[PDB]
Assembly symmetry: C3
Homo-oligomer: 162 residues x 3
């Protein structure tokens, strides 16, 4: 129960298990970035299909932070599982159930998810709650020219298509 | 106009409305992680098709930060809308128009986007501007062994496929 | 070799080039959020197919941070290249090779990746290593009501489908 001096600053996350039959989300290994979310339900996804899957939890992301729902890498490579809105963006004011928009990006093999499978991971990070300052031009804001300028969308090269 | 003591530290984001006919991006609710980006154009996406869509804004993400373009959850589940390069990564030096690489992941129904629809959200976060230190092995860097080791890509289990 | 007073706080990332024939990952422009990852191999992706591609590097993300593998925007729009598990989540304890789960989201044109192409970018950010506090209800935790409440999944509108 002792908070190591190292962890004095670590953030608490209130969580409600809407489905008490599932374990609390946990990190697979010390230092892992996210806690794994469970599926509360059985669902089968044919190739190309998506589903909105309940995780059985609600959280209270602190004000000034964001929760982020990321796909797991193993299911992504092994069976083509993804998340339509990845990274899913959990707002600090949200008090509903976290759901995951799973999608089967494999062309031929269905994906079967069972209740209690670990289907995604939840990260928590600080976010800047931006105050927009509208300007007529970045010059007017007295901003210096930058190296990148308006270069984007492959401008630096690195593939034959670019 | 008073900055609450709580918000003293909040980050300003210079923004140019390249399309002045669109509202400034805004947070839907207090504490929300992102501001919603508008489409500056009408575009129809057949199943499987993608488009590079103008948002009508340019921003100056502060040095030491990153802008992040995330899909909205409702369009993702309701109509299969996604973003090919999600999360889109807006560099601090970028001064061009923010564009969104929308894609229709539904197998059968086209997606119609109208000018003035909210099609994505923009977050701003700090980023570590990494100094790489090349080493011959993590041992040489005197790094301690870790629990995870070289485990990845589903190593912790949690689905029948893994 | 002088660390500018401005960069005193900048984070070092230990890296092993498992494939020494590839350049170290680098930022395309000052201030860019990520370093570009190379492919260590040649791979051809037919429409809809995915592959697990080696980058030739291993890193040691600091404890309290996360590495994030993001797609590049140019390949995403030009040829439909994406990443199945985007954003890929590199844990601080991981000492294996970084791999990228590339996928071809174009319906008709194959994507050819050559060894030495820049196929993704790696960001490093702080992460909150969450301590979960289970509560019976957010009321019990004495949390105030929020504007958003349980609204999600398009609740704020902004498209005809919502
Ligand atoms: O969703 C996005 C992503 C990028 N961009 C712009 C801003 C960003 O700084 C720039 C380059 O983004 P990436 O580095 O993610 N893509 P890529 O490496 O292909 O382009 P470049 O070669 O210019 O770095 O493109 C957008 O407008 N929207
Ligand atoms: O794009 C990625 C993502 C993950 N990885 C490696 C490093 C990360 O620490 C490890 C596990 O990532 P995930 O936790 O996102 N996937 P999963 O939960 O399936 O694997 P594990 O069960 O090992 O945690 O896989 C990559 O090499 N590239
Ligand atoms: O993966 C996710 C993403 C969002 N959500 C919930 C929490 C988040 O606060 C809420 C809204 O998320 P978005 O803002 O990303 N989507 P959208 O803009 O469509 O919904 P809203 O109009 O309610 O903001 O939906 C999930 O449960 N899982
Ligand atoms: Mg994992
Ligand atoms: Mg929203
Ligand atoms: Mg780039």
């Amino acid at each position: 129960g002792l908070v190591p001096r190292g962890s004095h600053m670590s953030t608490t996350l209130a969580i409600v298990r809407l489905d008490p039959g599932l374990p609390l989300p946990s990190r697979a290994h010390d230092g892992d970035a996210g806690v794994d979310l469970y599926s509360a339900e059985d669902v089968e996804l044919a190739p190309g299909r998506r589903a909105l899957v309940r995780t059985g939890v609600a959280v209270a992301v602190p004000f000034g932070m964001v929760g982020l729902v990321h796909p797991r890498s193993g299911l992504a490579t092994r069976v083509g599982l993804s998340i339509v809105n990845s990274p899913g963006t959990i707002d600090a004011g949200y008090r509903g159930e976290i759901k995951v928009a799973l999608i089967n990006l494999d062309p031929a093999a269905p994906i079967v998810v069972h209740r209690g499978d670990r289907i995604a991971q939840l990260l928590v990070q600080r976010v800047e709650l931006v105050e927009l300052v509208e300007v007529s031009s970045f010059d007017e804001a007295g901003l210096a020219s930058t190296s990148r300028g308006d270069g984007g969308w492959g401008s630096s090269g690195g593939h034959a298509s670019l």
